[PDB]
Amino acid sequence: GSHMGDKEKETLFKDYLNLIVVKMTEWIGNLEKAEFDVFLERSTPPHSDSDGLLFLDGTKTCFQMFTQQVEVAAGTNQAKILVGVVERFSDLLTKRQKNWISKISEEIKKQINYNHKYDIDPESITPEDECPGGLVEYLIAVSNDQMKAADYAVAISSKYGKLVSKVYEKQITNHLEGTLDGFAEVAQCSSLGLITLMFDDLRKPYQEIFSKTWYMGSQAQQIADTLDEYLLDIKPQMNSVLFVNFIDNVIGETIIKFLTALSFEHSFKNKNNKFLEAMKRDFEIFYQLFVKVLDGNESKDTLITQNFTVMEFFMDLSCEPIDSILDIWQKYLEVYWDSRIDLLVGILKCRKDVSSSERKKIVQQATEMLHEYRRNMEANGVDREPTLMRRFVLEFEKQ
């Protein structure tokens, strides 16, 4: 080529980086559109990789395209151009995450509408409610892609980071690692949306828990069966690491949803331990369901225990003598340190052998044992991870 001055070479590098960068925002822009069309129309079902894991093309093209750009950028041997491309791609990924979360959230509001308005069919459904099928499988796809995407980011980082000076490697690393938490967030959005879908088919049975027909009903079994179907299909087509967090929230929702039924205030009828017996029955159905789903999984015992235990404290707080309620509550707190006082309030209100005034005194005390326990935890510098009960809520007016 011809001669070039340093000023003109720099200008060339700055103008080149810019053209590349602008093109990238355009590319991603178009991909997102095509990507959201597929996801929204679901006119076909997500593909499957060698390991049976579902996936979408969007994520795949996205990193194919970039792996192409980084090559050219690096071939340039100009760190500014390399980091510039890496930077742009990282900011575009983060924004992409923001958009997907928004899209995932709307499809689920849609579905949960295409359902309730299908509950009464076309008498109540306009072309606006029109919701294609296959969301479940798509939600799993989107979930698995986040994990893959997160791994691609890390690989790109360690690869291209070592090709530049320290100051520049640091930048590449922060840019790319800056996207990681966000992929997990998108995955959590889709994981939890799937759960919202699953439990939406269980509104009727859950609202009948503790009612007259529940003592000898089939509610828990209906729930187990509906969940069992989903999980049979889901477990195989989902990233193994995400499955643990997922099954943990499914088990956690099965119980939170169960205990919430304390809101109806049906008195516990325990003549001949029929309440207890009803509880042991339901407990066994759910217990067997997940012990089966978690077959072979190393987290099984932990997942079962951290979740099912509150069911046992619940049976006790509900049936044991009133004189032992607080000892049980203490032992309860030791496991669910982050628990509210709500569960006890609800339990006591269904207790035929506890008067209002007796409830107030028990709660006052119980509430005190709660703070005493946490306050005492700080003093001893005790740190523990959250439990299932951090989120159980049952609105009640202080007596």
Curated annotation (Swiss-Prot):
Subcellular location: Cytoplasm
Intrachain disulfide bonds: none
Additional free-text comment from the UniProt record: Present with 1080 molecules/cell in log phase SD medium.
Function statement: Component of the exocyst complex involved in the docking of exocytic vesicles with fusion sites on the plasma membrane.
Family membership: Belongs to the SEC6 family.
Quaternary assembly: The exocyst complex is composed of SEC3, SEC5, SEC6, SEC8, SEC10, SEC15, EXO70 and EXO84.
Protein name: Exocyst complex component SEC6
Organism placement in taxonomy: Eukaryota, Fungi, Dikarya, Ascomycota, Saccharomycotina
Gene: SEC6
Whole-protein coverage range: 411 to 805 of 805
